[PDB]
Design a protein around this ligand. Structure first.
Ligand SMILES: [Ca+2]
Ligand SMILES: [Ca+2]
Lengths: 613, 611
């Protein structure tokens, strides 16, 4: 990009000023003997700049020079307050740089001389963007508490570093630590922050969400943080009793699901994209709910919703094959090739009640296409069109077939009551979608779930890299088969009588479903045989018989993700019905309070086996 | 099922009535100071109940609070004789808790005051059910003898704990040690139980069957336990001699062999469904019977009975193709689709003695149909209605084919001397099932054997998850194709002239056997060439060529669970034959007894090499 080259030009111009401006060079080389000479009788210069507008203190801070910064604090005791000011770096101060480079004795010096511990690091490089490497928030407490320098963490809080602090993204200091991938310390560094949460108001520092409304318990599951999730879980897990090897424990379940307002954690999991945000389902309180919500309640309602669906498509199919048809309205087979002896009725014949019994049947299937549009036009009303044509399998392309099937039946309603000739065209797409859409209910089955994802994976993923190989090879030999048979009879051996037939014939000799154009009464032209024998090798025993190995390579190599997706297919099916079915038949999952002195949070009982003495 | 929920509902109620009645509350947190204050002057309360009617002494022990338990015995010396009075906890007295929770000093003191160390505990959580976690039996001696605490085992017997004591499941202590999963101590504790057995006037301890008639050597074999089955063997394995590295060794074979009285270990293994039960059949006093019982006597008797089966079908197959047929009795010429010009005879045509030669062919093939219904009735009458329709592959679905074969042959017998027209249809199943039922004799072959398991394993498990993914698609495009060609002639391009043919002709295009319809003289409707192309992409290179990789993935994943089943398939043939044939051509396995100075137990000799 043109933007990333701008970072290169400045950072080389940043170094050019260091080869100029001799005190900055004296600052980089830890040169103190020149720096006394360049200041203590003439000086004249002390508020220097660079390419990023930094000072000699910042230069003496980026390279670890306690001696050089010692003279600079003594020379001008107002260097410590002003920040960097540029496009990329903005608002960063010498307190920040001294933190990230772990320089404990320098931070001890700067706080004694007076440094702003609330300096906003509002620069351009600091934003949480994937083309930046590290994201440490803004405040100098966050820069310490992320790299794990817990001594400086203790050093800052003694000088009035506020824990409550939000960035431009609304994140607090606990939202940050969940985001570093090299975790390793952030179990321990988490607790040191709560050890300074001793005296506050009623919001106990974890009930403070981000800008998009997401507490650090919620943020741990959304970001795929297995290590920090169990560390948070130990806080809200209550152990009831132990009895030899049986330990029964309670779980909080106040935000695990508690699917009662808008932002249940089970809803947040099956919307995301991250591969590791989906294995929270492995963990011990969530793998109980989505089992019990599905097995006692979710499974039988889903089949009743499925078994009512098959009887709908049949009622549409049973009124499809009973179209009104006339025998051969007006014409008589004029050139050739008019194998067409029928005509549909005008809509002036609904007499003879087994043509009227269908009329109450289509009215069933014409209101069935209204209710599907009424349940999916309010789906783009809440979340955008990138949900449909995004390839999120958790409710995948089964939301673009059912709309088109709903959209096609109304076109038949438009093709009816206008008396237009061509109207097999919506009804042909109406059946090939309306039957292939009962594939959606192959989802909650034990044996037929994870097969369906493999069909969905080879349609796009491993046939959009074969059809571009199919359409090229066909376009050669189909055009080549035209030229050979151009000066020939289409009567005897007539597989190619024009070019739009000549693809359709050649397309099926590639798939080996038609036989292969051969006649023996007549003498085929000699270039037909050489051309077709090269077609038969490359297609039949080099392309199709490559593709069977192409599947089998990619079949055993991803059969540990389809067992992860299929479980998440069930969960997104479960929560979809919880926010849709009215609460007369799904009770709230778990055990409530206030019959027991509990605290009104809905709880859930878990008992396991300790297997040690 | 709200019952396990109802377990969870009551567990909070104990934890609510403990916050009331504060001596129960102090009993949890062993507050010895306040417990003095609630007792020494007024008290008035000590016979408390909980949600399950439990005591303060229970809660003082359910949490290991020994100091508070000291005061309760001194204040109330009557609590130790009364049980928990509920459904979920019935009969569990205060001793049961302190045993499982390993409390040495409390059991030393509770028996010092003296508790019933033989009282029974029969709550709903304690019965041997798959939903409860641990099963430690009923009696308090069993609870010590399942956790590994050898001292409490030594302590209870000194105070009068009867070892020989059965539960409602009839299990002893020695049956229950077999059932814990992580053994790790139980084999080491197994010696401690038989140390206290004396061998009295009564029968010795391991000769006690359970409530379902089963000894603790059999129950190590049914449950798939290996490590107990090793340790049980050394008490009955006699060393003959050694010769350098060689050891010739004489095994007991008292109960391992069939020997009549059908509760035998080689019987009880291949009837059960536990997967690790068939892992026993590699242990050395078992794998050598089933070699010698099969190699010298199970191999030829099975194949000779195999050859009389092939001669049975051919004597029906030649009998089938020689029916009597008249040319076209009285009808003529439905002017289309009436290719029907032969008609079977009424049974008034038994002239021409190549019908008399056929008459013995029917009667040979009609008696074998009866003898199957005399050999296979004594299995569903011997409780096999859940075994045939059960998918126990050890004798799999070949037992439901052969009854269906014998049923259709007798339907044919009804068809003759009734002169009903449809005899082709029941005779048509009598060939595709009769010939495919010779596949059962491909069991005892070195080579052909474990392939037949994969055929049985693909029909149920990797094809029935594909036939549902066909009848969806193949019902889509058949009703699609029929509407396209509805305004078209059936005379030319008549692949779909009515709708039941339109499914059947679609079913073959999905398998690539018909060529796909085409007729280059007549102009196809333009919606045909769009649809059929997209049906030939789904079928040929996306569904069929995916079904092949479904096969090839799971083949090398059960390529070592068919070499487990086939070895267990052979043994289930030998044991089935051994009780069926009279023991006059079968010798009994092993060497005899009292002809040598032995003691009548049928022994067996196996010699090995050490290293
Ligand atoms: Ca052909
Ligand atoms: Ca063919």
């Amino acid at each position: 990009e043109s933007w990333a080259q701008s970072r290169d030009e400045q950072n080389l111009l940043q170094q050019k000023r260091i080869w100029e401006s001799p005190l900055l060079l004296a600052a980089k080389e830890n040169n103190v003997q020149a720096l006394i000479k360049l200041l203590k009788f003439e000086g004249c210069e002390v508020h220097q700049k660079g390419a990023m507008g930094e000072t000699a203190l910042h230069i003496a801070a980026l390279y670890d020079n306690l001696e050089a910064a010692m003279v600079l604090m003594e020379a001008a005791p107002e260097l410590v307050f002003e920040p960097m000011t540029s496009e990329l770096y903005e608002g960063q101060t010498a307190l920040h740089i001294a933190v990230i480079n772990q320089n404990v004795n320098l931070v001890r010096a700067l706080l004694a001389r007076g440094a702003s511990v609330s300096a906003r690091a509002t620069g351009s490089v600091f934003h949480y963007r994937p083309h930046n490497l590290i994201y440490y928030g803004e405040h100098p407490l966050s820069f310490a508490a992320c790299v794990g320098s817990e001594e400086i963490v203790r050093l800052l809080i003694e000088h009035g570093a506020d824990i409550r602090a939000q960035d431009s993204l609304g994140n607090t200091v606990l939202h940050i630590l969940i985001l570093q991938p090299n975790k390793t310390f952030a179990c321990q560094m988490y607790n040191l922050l709560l050890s300074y949460d001793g005296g506050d108001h009623l919001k106990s520092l974890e009930l403070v969400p981000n800008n998009q409304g997401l507490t650090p318990f919620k943020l741990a599951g959304v970001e795929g943080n297995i290590v920090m999730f169990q560390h948070l879980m130990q806080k809200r897990k209550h152990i009831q009793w132990t009895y030899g090897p049986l330990t029964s424990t309670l779980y909080d379940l106040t935000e695990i699901d508690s699917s009662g307002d808008d932002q249940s954690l089970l809803e947040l999991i099956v919307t995301t994209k991250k591969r590791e945000a989906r294995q929270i389902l492995d963990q011990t309180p969530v793998k109980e709910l989505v089992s019990l919500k599905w097995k006692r309640y979710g499974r039988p309602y889903f089949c009743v919703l499925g078994a009512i669906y098959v009887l709908y498509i049949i009622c549409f199919t049973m009124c499809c094959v009973y179209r009104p048809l006339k025998p051969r309205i007006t014409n008589r087979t004029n050139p050739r090739d008019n194998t067409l002896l029928q005509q549909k009725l005008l809509q002036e014949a609904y007499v003879t009640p087994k043509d009227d019994l269908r009329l109450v049947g289509e009215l069933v299937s014409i209101v069935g296409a209204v209710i599907i549009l009424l349940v999916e036009i309010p789906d783009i009303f809440r979340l955008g069109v990138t949900r449909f044509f995004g390839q999120t399998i958790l409710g995948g392309p089964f939301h673009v077939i059912i709309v088109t099937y709903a959209f096609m039946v109304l076109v038949t309603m438009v093709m009816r009551l206008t008396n237009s000739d061509g109207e097999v065209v919506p009804m042909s797409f109406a059946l090939v979608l309306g039957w292939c859409n009962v594939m959606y209910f192959a989802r909650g089955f034990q044996m037929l779930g994870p097969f369906t994802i493999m069909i969905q994976k080879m349609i796009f993923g491993d046939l959009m890299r074969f059809c571009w190989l199919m359409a090229v090879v066909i376009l050669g030999f189909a055009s080549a088969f035209y030229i050979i048979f151009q000066t020939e009879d289409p009567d005897e051996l007539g597989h190619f009588y024009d070019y739009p037939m000549a693809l359709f014939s050649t397309f099926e000799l590639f798939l080996t479903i038609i036989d292969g154009p051969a006649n023996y009464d007549v003498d085929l032209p000699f270039m037909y045989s050489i051309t077709y024998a090269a077609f038969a090798i490359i297609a039949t025993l080099l392309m199709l018989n490559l593709l069977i190995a192409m599947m089998g390579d990619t079949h055993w190599r991803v059969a540990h993700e389809r067992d992860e997706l299929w479980r998440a297919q069930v969960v997104a099916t479960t929560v979809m019905l919880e926010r849709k079915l009215p609460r007369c038949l799904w009770p709230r999952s778990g055990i409530c309070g206030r019959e027991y002195g509990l605290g009104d949070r809905w709880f859930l009982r878990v008992e396991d086996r300790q297997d040690l003495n």
